[PDB]
Amino acid sequence: MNARDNKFNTWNDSRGNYWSDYEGSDENGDGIGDSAYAVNPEAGSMDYMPLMEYLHSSPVLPTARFTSDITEGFAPLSVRFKDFSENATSRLWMFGDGNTSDSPSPLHTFFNEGEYIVSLIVSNENDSDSASVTIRALEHHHHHH
Numbered sequence: 001m002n003a004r005d006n007k008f009n010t011w012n013d014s015r016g017n018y019w020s021d022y023e024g025s026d027e028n029g030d031g032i033g034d035s036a037y038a039v040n041p042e043a044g045s046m047d048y049m050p051l052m053e054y055l056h057s058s059p060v061l062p063t064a065r066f067t068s069d070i071t072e073g074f075a076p077l078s079v080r081f082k083d084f085s086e087n088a089t090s091r092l093w094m095f096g097d098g099n100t101s102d103s104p105s106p107l108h109t110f111f112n113e114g115e116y117i118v119s120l121i122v123s124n125e126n127d128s129d130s131a132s133v134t135i136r137a138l139e140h141h142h143h144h145h
Helices: none
Strands: 072-074 090-093 114-123 128-138
Touching: none
Parallel strands: 072 128
Antiparallel strands: 090 114, 114 128
16 A cells, blocks of 8 residues: 555647649740742743755666577577676676686687576676576477477
């Protein structure tokens, strides 16, 4: 049995009401109107081209022409060929023996008969012309009844 005098009480108290406000109002705009006009009059439809035509320049070419002494008959001993080569640089006599153009005789001796073909051929810087004729030397006693 004893006595004790004690009183206990603890006071803690916190009070406060705090707040903030967002203040954010700002404007920034942009813009630009640009017009552009170039002065273009018309289109360049400008075209000029003249015409000069010439004619066809007609060239001259040779002609190998000749006459045979006989055309048909008995084979003779003198058959002179007369050439009528026109527009020719040179006339070439081709018999088929040895050389050519240089013939020792304008007349030829047919020692036998037969059907020959003589060809005169001429040459020129433009063209060359050759023509042949059938030399008909008839065989003796060849027509049998």
